[PDB]
Amino acid sequence: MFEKAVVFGLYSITPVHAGSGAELSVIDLPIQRERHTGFPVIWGQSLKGVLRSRFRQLELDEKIEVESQKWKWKEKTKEVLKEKADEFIKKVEERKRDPLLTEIVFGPATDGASEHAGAVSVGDAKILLFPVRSAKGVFAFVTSPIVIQRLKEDFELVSEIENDIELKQILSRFKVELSNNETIAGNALILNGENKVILEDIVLKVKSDSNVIENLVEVLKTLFGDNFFGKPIESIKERIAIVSDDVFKSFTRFSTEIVARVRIDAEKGTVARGGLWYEEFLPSDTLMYSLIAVGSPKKENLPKEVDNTQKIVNVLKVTFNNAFLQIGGDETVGKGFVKVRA
Amino acid sequence: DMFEKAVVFGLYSITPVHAGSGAELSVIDLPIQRERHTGFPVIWGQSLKGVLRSRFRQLELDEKIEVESQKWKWKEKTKEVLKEKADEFIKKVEERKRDPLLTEIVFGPATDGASEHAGAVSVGDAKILLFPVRSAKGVFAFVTSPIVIQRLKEDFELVSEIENDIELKQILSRFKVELSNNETIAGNALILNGENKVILEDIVLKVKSDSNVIENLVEVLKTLFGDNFFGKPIESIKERIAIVSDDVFKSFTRFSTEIVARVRIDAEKGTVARGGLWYEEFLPSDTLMYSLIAVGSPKKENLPKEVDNTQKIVNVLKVTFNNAFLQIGGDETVGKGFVKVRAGV
Amino acid sequence: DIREIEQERASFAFKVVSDIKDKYSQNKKVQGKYSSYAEKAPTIILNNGLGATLAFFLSKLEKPIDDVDYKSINPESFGNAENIAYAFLYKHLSTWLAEGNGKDSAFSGLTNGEDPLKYIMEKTAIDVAISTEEALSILNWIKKFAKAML
Amino acid sequence: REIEQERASFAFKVVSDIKDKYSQNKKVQGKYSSYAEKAPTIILNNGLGATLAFFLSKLEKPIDDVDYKSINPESFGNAENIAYAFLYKHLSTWLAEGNGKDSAFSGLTNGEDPLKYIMEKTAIDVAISTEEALSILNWIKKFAKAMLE
Amino acid sequence: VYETSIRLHRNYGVPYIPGSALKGVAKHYAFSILARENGDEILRIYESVKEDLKARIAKRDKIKKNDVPEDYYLTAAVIQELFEKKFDELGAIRNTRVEIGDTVISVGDIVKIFGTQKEEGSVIFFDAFPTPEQLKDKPNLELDIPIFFLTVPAGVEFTFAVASRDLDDLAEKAEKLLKEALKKFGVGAKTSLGYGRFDA
DNA sequence: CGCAAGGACCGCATACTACAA
RNA sequence: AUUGAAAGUUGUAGUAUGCGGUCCUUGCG
User: Fold this and answer.
1) DSSP per residue over B168-202, as a string?
2) I want to staple E170 with a disulfide (CB 3.0 to 4.6 A). Which of B320, B327, D12, E113 is the partner?
3) Residues 6 or more apart in contact with residue C133 via CB below 8 angstroms
4) β-sheet bridge partners, residue B6
5) What one-character DSSP code corresponds to residue E170?
6) Residue among A270, A260, A216 at smallest CA distance from A241
7) 3-class DSSP state for residue A95?
8) Is the minimum CB–CB distance between C129 and chain B shorter than 8 Å?
9) Would you give the distance in Å from CA C95 to the centre of its chain?
10) How is domain C2-150 classified at the CATH fold level?
11) Going by DSSP bridges, is the β-strand pair B288-296/B3-13 parallel, antiparallel, or unpaired?
12) CA distance D105 to D95
């Protein structure tokens, strides 16, 4: 199925730490990666969980603009389920089940996991842009041809859903290959000397094929609105660098933030037993995308307001657009705040 | 998610600050916390949370916390809430095993009962806002950068989203600066008497002619921190503000910080102990710092009737920490790391 | 085929420091003075500026500060141990800031074969700041190796 | 898991060898245990080359040239010097040859001096050497803390 | 670049006295007064530390272990080592009451005030800033010798402060100790040649 | 007329699969 | 001319909660 697709773009306002599994190796709590390549990633389970929680919390306040009507959980449930609805309302009061809209879209709760599946699917969020310190200029966005390759693959997958031939052609228009150390750099990052763009601890050579970079910016303008998540897109167009695969992988491993944290005793004035530990944080301004898919709503006796893939897609688009999300652990210490552009 | 109200905390250093970041092998033996990609100084939210919780617990233990114009006694109030188990909680608290009732409710449970429930505050990072830089004509300008303004606009958008009030977005919507690599939107006071030039540190550069920007900035400060920038009249700040490009701004935060050569002289020889020579790095005094604190609904079961709504918690924190003096970073006894805090909305 | 500047920094620092031990093995005073100067330079750089420190080095070498040619300063010319150490330190710093590890190496200096003092004289602030950063890093590495071996 | 067993055996062997020297002297045992514990922190902050340079510097001798071989830890005078020479010897040995030709891990440096290897190689070699040093240090921390006094 | 410099304030340029110097001179003066009066008891109680310090001094000075004299300086070094890492045994001698000024302060009070490696101190030593009124008319800097350096002239006012972080009232004793130290020893380089003395 | 950090503490405690088929 | 032909280990589910890189130390003879 999955007759409709919405691309979600995330911008990290603050450093984000999505907790990995067992805390092994030298670093205590590392970010989630993939052994297959080594790049950072966010598994779809956490994304679906946070989206479901936000959706349910919004629905409980009757702030969800269901076709600009502010659908009421109790009223809609009574209209749909009729006689038994009241009983379900009690289950909603006990925080056992969930209101009608979120149950229909994201699937039911644990105790009722035998009626219908979830009408949505949330893919893993993959990196697309990585901040990196630079000598001239500051804070250069970086990316690699493999990322663009995966992006083209995702576009092709979308085309198998909505027949977006123009998007496929636009993606196929871009084809670059930096060999070992040369980079495609914007005008700002270029050192005042002859080429020689210096990223972190590496000195590179610029390559004069910047049109491709421009095309990439166009793709962004095609995908995530006009302003680049609240900034002038052309402003970011001056600070984009494309580098080889191995260099990008090296950046995605030895440039995440590393932080040491301690606990202070009540009155001793110094650390205590089991107080010192380490954490790894994904840098701010990291751009990561995903792929949300929607198929046929499998819920029984769905409401007339939301009874087609187009309706669900519109609801998701309006509810999540320039909104804000809390992602991962370390919430109370200001970590995980992101801006979502659909 | 669960937050409904927010407060913008402003920090004004009166003494050099030093937030430790471990020890390196570079020229500076005790550097400061910085974001990796940008390279600008920063204070993480964890240190702020720890300091605030410590101060709150200290004030509650001495029964000096005044919620709704009344002291929140640790033993008396917790007796009503915990009911039968209050005796166990009181003894455990006295044994420094768990934090008092109010601290536990606000800043979340203590280390022993970490799996009980969650907190209600989300104190965030402290991004730089105004870097004090020595100037040739005039004294001690408040340099800032367009990146800082953009980040500030983002935080204001987040605050307006939490509060559902577009006034903040409207106020910040006018911010749009495009300063070049050698031009500053300087205030009148800092302007050198000459060809409209400013000598900041080792950089001399022409002054772009623009208006209705600096004033806007000052207006923002008047929105949250009352009318006095940490006590001083806002007019001097308005006349003493400069804005420069990202490159020079970063160049300033890398070579315009205090550097000290502390030692430890041994008694026997009277000159210096073996290996007693190192350099410490400090943020300068009069640095303007800002951070965001978000407040959600309390999660502890059977909470006291005084603290049930996020509004009450916000009022409590605003009353407690407004115009107070706090300690941040290391060398507390040596005399470094004292700041003045201001709240707002 | 890609080496970060860290590899070239250590390679360069090892080259010069080892070049002192074999040259002036018997002159322990020269080695000690060179080590002390390498320890003390970064604070001067951080306190005054790269141009100030370079001019100071020239002043201790009784040479005019307006026209310089690091490629024309034989360290063996100076007679005093302090003077010889200062000449060696200045030559190493200027050579790194001009040619880096080498033209073949990944890093090839910053001034592109220009006297660093003149480069600071006739460039904008950003170039001076980046050159200062590079000088700080190489001074750190040279101090490390000099303390380790000298 | 063969590499894991190799690392565990090597860590036990080196910790036992440290136990043999100055077994009664809790000064050398105590200093070495703290030295192994605090070592991985440096590597994260400053990289492998900087940590190796620091280890070379803390030794109190002319230390002419650079040799992972030689530099007998017993020849060092101060107890701290002996412990640091031991730590450097063990780490360099593991990175150079591991446990031997027939071992599962023959060492990434092909028997070459780790510092010289870092000085004249590519970036990826430095990366893998760094990761391997981190892993062996992680094992050595536990094994030295467990039994050494 | 100049052969000499002073700790001038970054933002304003007025010279000032850091709180670290205050704490250091106070600890040094307390050590001196403790060693001068009760020298024999301190030397006898911690015999092992005395022997270790003698051995270390002999090794550093390349002299014989017995050649080290048990002068007041050796006592000061032993006391300094006692307040260092080997601070657990100091409680053995935690009974002497040093007569600082006109009040008796116990060594336990010294540990509680100054702070130790395993416990933060309870007394904060702020910095010292000359009053602007004096700077209004009287000059604040002067030359002093062909080698010249800038120094603060005599008679310049300076205000000091001391706080008590905890409920311990050791603030008054700390203030008395600081006042006595400033009166007798003073703070500043070249303190042998009268520099740094402070009157009332 | 030279001197050149050094040790403490180095993830704790809790959760540790449920219901259908 | 075979205990044979037929049957998606599938549905739900945020590695999360608590935690101050802190203490000790005169840049000096």
Assistant:
1) HHHHHTT------TTEE---TTTSBTTTTEEEETT
2) E113
3) A135, B254
4) B294
5) T
6) A216
7) coil
8) yes
9) 7
10) Peroxidase; domain 1 (1.10.520)
11) antiparallel
12) 9
Question: Which alpha helices (DSSP H) does C1-150 contain, by range?
Answer: 5-23, 28-47, 50-60, 81-99, 116-121, 125-149
Q: How far is CA D63 from CA A42, A318, D76, in A?
A: 49, 69, 11
Give the pair of three-digit tokens for residue A29.
């709590």
Chain A: closest CA distance from residue C67 (Å): 23
Q: Which two tokens stand for residue D6?
A: 């190799």
Give the DSSP per-residue string, D60-119: -S---S--SS---GGG-SSHHHHHHHHHHHHHHHHHHHTT-TTSS---TTTT--HHHHHH
User: Which amino acid, E41?
Assistant: E
DSSP A200-266: TTEE--B-S-THHHHHHHHHHHHHS-SSSSSS-HHHHTTSEEE--HHHHHHHTTSSSEEEEE--B-S
Deposited experimental method: cryo-EM
Token pair, residue D139, equals 């094992």
**Type of residue numbered A158:** V
Domain spanning D1-148, CATH class: mainly alpha
Q: Are strands A120-122 and A292-294 parallel, antiparallel or unpaired?
A: antiparallel
* Residue tagged 């390279």 (tokens): B39
Please give the single-letter amino acid code of residue D123: A
Spatial distance between the Cα atoms of E33 and E104, rounded to a whole number of angstroms: 12
The SS3 assignment for E69 reads coil
Domain ranges of chain D: 1-148
CB D37 within 8 A of CB D29: no
Q: Please state whether beta strands B280-282 and B288-296 pair in parallel, antiparallel, or not at all (unpaired).
A: unpaired
- Chain D residues with CB under 8 Å of B27 CB are none
Please give the DSSP secondary-structure letter assigned to residue B84.
Answer: G
**Main-chain dihedrals φ then ψ at residue E90, nearest 5 degrees:** -60, -25
Closest approach of B24 to chain A, Cα-based (Å): 13
| Neighbouring residues of C89: CB distance < 8 A, sequence distance ≥ 6 | C34, C37, C38, C41, C57
For residue E6, say whether its CB is under 7 Å from any atom of strand G: no
Tell me the C-alpha distance between C131 and C120, whole Å: 9
**Residue labelled with tokens 């989203």:** B161
